[PDB]
């Protein structure tokens, strides 16, 4: 029973690796702009929410993708899952 959030903008994250900084700029459109999540009411801890959200969002979006893609999406979808938590908090 994982819901799917509405579209949001993909963040722009900068990486220490010059390769990865640039890889992200070019490929960022290949990554989710929505996130899967179990509902905020089933968690006391945002860390568990985000962790779940990242795991499911990245599975659903691969169930095409490099190892580098998965580092990218780990940092970037976390940040989107945090945004989504913010969305549910406000509500
Ligand atoms: Cl996480």
Describe this structure in words.
The protein has 91 residues and is mostly helical. It has one domain. 54% of the residues lie in helices and 4% in strands. The protein has a two-stranded antiparallel ribbon. α2 crosses α3 (67-90). The relative contact order is 0.22. Chloride ion binds at residues 50-51, 54, 78. Chloride ion (CL) binds next to α2.
Strand coverage percent: under 5%
- Distinct compounds present: chloride ion
Outline the biggest β-sheet.
2 strands, antiparallel
Q: Radius of gyration from the CA trace?
A: 13 Å
Strand order of the largest sheet: 1-2
Q: What global shape is seen?
A: elongated
Order of helices and strands: EHEHH
Q: Into how many domains do the coordinates divide?
A: 1
Number of strands: 2
Helix-strand category = mainly alpha
Helix content: 40-55%
Count of helical stretches: 3
Distance between the termini: 19 Å
Protein name: Major prion protein
Subcellular location: Cell membrane; Golgi apparatus
Organism: Homo sapiens
Family: Belongs to the prion family.
């Amino acid at each position: 029973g994982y819901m799917l959030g509405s579209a949001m903008s993909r963040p722009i994250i900068h990486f220490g690796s010059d390769y990865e900084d640039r890889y992200y700029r070019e490929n960022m459109h290949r990554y989710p702009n929505q996130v899967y999540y179990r509902p905020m009411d089933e968690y006391s801890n945002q860390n568990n929410f985000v962790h779940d959200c990242v795991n499911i969002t990245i599975k659903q979006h691969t169930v095409n993708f490099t190892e580098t893609d998965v580092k990218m999406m780990e940092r970037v979808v976390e940040q989107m899952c945090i945004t989504q938590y913010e969305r549910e908090s406000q509500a």
